[PDB]
Amino acid sequence: MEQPEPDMITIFIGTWNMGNAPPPKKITSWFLSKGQGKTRDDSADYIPHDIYVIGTQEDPLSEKEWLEILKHSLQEITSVTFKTVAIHTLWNIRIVVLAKPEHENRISHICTDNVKTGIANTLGNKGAVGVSFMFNGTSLGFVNSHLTSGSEKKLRRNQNYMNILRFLALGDKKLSPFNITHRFTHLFWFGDLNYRVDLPTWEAETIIQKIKQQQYADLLSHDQLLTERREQKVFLHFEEEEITFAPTYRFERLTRDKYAYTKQKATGMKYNLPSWCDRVLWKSYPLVHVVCQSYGSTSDIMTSDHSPVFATFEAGVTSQFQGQIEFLRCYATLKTKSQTKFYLEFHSSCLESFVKSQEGENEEGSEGELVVKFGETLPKLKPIISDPEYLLDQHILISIKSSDSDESYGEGCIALRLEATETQLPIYTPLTHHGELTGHFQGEIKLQTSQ
Numbered sequence: 001m002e003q004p005e006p007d008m009i010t011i012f013i014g015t016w017n018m019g020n021a022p023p024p025k026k027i028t029s030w031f032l033s034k035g036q037g038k039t040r041d042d043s044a045d046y047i048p049h050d051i052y053v054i055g056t057q058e059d060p061l062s063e064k065e066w067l068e069i070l071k072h073s074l075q076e077i078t079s080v081t082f083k084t085v086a087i088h089t090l091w092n093i094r095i096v097v098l099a100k101p102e103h104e105n106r107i108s109h110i111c112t113d114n115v116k117t118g119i120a121n122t123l124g125n126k127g128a129v130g131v132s133f134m135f136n137g138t139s140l141g142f143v144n145s146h147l148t149s150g151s152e153k154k155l156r157r158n159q160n161y162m163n164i165l166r167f168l169a170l171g172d173k174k175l176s177p178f179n180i181t182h183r184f185t186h187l188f189w190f191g192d193l194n195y196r197v198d199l200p201t202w203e204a205e206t207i208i209q210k211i212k213q214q215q216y217a218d219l220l221s222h223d224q225l226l227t228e229r230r231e232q233k234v235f236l237h238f239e240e241e242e243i244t245f246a247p248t249y250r251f252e253r254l255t256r257d258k259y260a261y262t263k264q265k266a267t268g269m270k271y272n273l274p275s276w277c278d279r280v281l282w283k284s285y286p287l288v289h290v291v292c293q294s295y296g297s298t299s300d301i302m303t304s305d306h307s308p309v310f311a312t313f314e315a316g317v318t319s320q321f322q323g324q325i326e327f328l329r330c331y332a333t334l335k336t337k338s339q340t341k342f343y344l345e346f347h348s349s350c351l352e353s354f355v356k357s358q359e360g361e362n363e364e365g366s367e368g369e370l371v372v373k374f375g376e377t378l379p380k381l382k383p384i385i386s387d388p389e390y391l392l393d394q395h396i397l398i399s400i401k402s403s404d405s406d407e408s409y410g411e412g413c414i415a416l417r418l419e420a421t422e423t424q425l426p427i428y429t430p431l432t433h434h435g436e437l438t439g440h441f442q443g444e445i446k447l448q449t450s451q
């Protein structure tokens, strides 16, 4: 019978700060998405995901021991003997990628990297590990980060984020102007991000009462990560599924009935109010299928002062295998105050190589911003394949560069998934540089396929 290539895979993301302690004997609940929150129904337990990505922090095991525990747990659940795709460890921060044996011919171009984020490196043990690879014609990226601890240190966590984003080297190195937040069709970023609930310590019993009544709304409105995301300080244009599970930190170990939030010598005389430290976020190219099917925490794995967190995703993928991409009325708006002239660069695997535009025309925006107008002067891109079943599924990455310095001042992405061809249609992408919002790009596009 026919052997189609998949257009959709399911991905499991797990993040667990193990608190430097060996795991219990049974951790199957983690991979089954069993516990609290948006959980997975019993009926699906025997259905294996295509890829399992496991991030740990404060992991005390050797790679061989953890790999053993993980494969046994997955065999218990699925019968399948998963292949190791990659495993990479920095200090006690670790990422494991496992995949169905039937996908081993579909996965290629595997890379790993890590970034240390310390004020004295050798002093702190924080940072990130990552893995990227191609699944057929889709690029995938995964980042597991352990950010700075402490309720008062949200600015340091934001800096950690920004440094991992800028310096982690994954994916297609030909995408020179782009950092990991634009190099992948799907990017998953997870870990002990260490953001806390910002409420007074003397409120701790009130917080616990709310957790016991499962009213998280008031607590989540004080979550540092959601606040900093809303204020565009971190994780620009990422998504996160609604949190519907209790805070995953800080628990008394060996039970799940006590939040150990008070100060004591072991914690440096610091409070650890209940917090959603452990998180999974994602960022996918526009108009690519991605749906979160579970996001929650386990209840029965109690060896750490964190509970494990799980999330699962359906993610759209593509495979192997005149045309013209025209831009009209295009312009960028930039927060910059540089007086340089700016040009555009277009990158895409539908192109034989990236295309460089001529410089735009500068003018002062209404609100005192810089407006760079390109008009109908932009190059007409000639894709290597004209079939609309292929071209409509592609994306064009855009970098706006200084002609004085050749550095990018902003990066974004445009989907070719259009409602019409040979027709002018509006396009838009925000622009970020080094992970911060720097402007916007808008205009019209006209796509020609073979029809």
Ligand SMILES: *CCC(=O)c1nc(C#N)ccc1N1CCCOCC1
Pocket: 109, 110, 111, 132, 133, 134, 138, 139, 140, 170, 171, 172, 173, 174, 184
């Ligand atoms: C090490 C990165 C790598 O092998 C790679 N990864 C992706 C993704 N996702 C796509 C392409 C590539 N290669 C190898 C190195 C980068 O430049 C050429 C393409």
